[PDB]
Amino acid sequence: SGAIYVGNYRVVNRHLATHNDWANLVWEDSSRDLLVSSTTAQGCDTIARCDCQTGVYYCSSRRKHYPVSFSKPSLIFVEASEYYPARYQSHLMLAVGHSEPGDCGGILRCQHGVVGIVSTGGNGLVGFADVRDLLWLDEE
Numbered sequence: 001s002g003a004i005y006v007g008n009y010r011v012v013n014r015h016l017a018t019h020n021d022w023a024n025l026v027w028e029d030s031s032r033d034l035l036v037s038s039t040t041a042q043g044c045d046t047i048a049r050c051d052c053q054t055g056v057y058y059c060s061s062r063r064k065h066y067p068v069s070f071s072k073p074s075l076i077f078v079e080a081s082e083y084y085p086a087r088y089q090s091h092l093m094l095a096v097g098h099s100e101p102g103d104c105g106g107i108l109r110c111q112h113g114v115v116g117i118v119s120t121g122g123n124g125l126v127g128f129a130d131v132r133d134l135l136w137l138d139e140e
């Protein structure tokens, strides 16, 4: 589990979104595994605006933050899980790292701020949903 709290937005994995998220919906994209909902309180996270390929992510199944190198956001064939059939997931970045389903939502961050959230993995591979192209997270 986990979210990004930026401005009056809450950024979650679409497959973990609650009823309250869907009732306060701003934007959702199944192909990216992303959903954004509105919040009453302002959040403290800042979004990175960059092409970093190094950063640190939170792994809940180890209670540890790991430094990683990660690929640029891409269209990547992701094998079927409990939440999605085998499909191309878009805006996905891959790194070598431990992940399990409940790690979803862990933040990846670089020197500039938040880069994305854990979305998928297995076999020592972790995939992150990028948010750095979502420039509207920084306004209104």
Ligand SMILES: Cc1cc(C)c(Nc2ccn(C3COC3)n2)c(C)c1
Residues within 6 Å of the ligand: 078, 079, 080, 081, 082, 099, 100, 101, 102, 103, 104, 118, 119, 120, 121, 122
């Ligand atoms: C963060 C994270 C998210 C998901 C959904 C998984 N499990 C998945 C993904 C693809 N598979 C196929 C079915 O057996 C291989 N299982 C994992 C391990 C980590």
Ligand SMILES: [Zn+2]
Residues within 6 Å of the ligand: 048, 049, 050, 051, 052, 110, 111, 112, 113
């Ligand atoms: Zn950066």
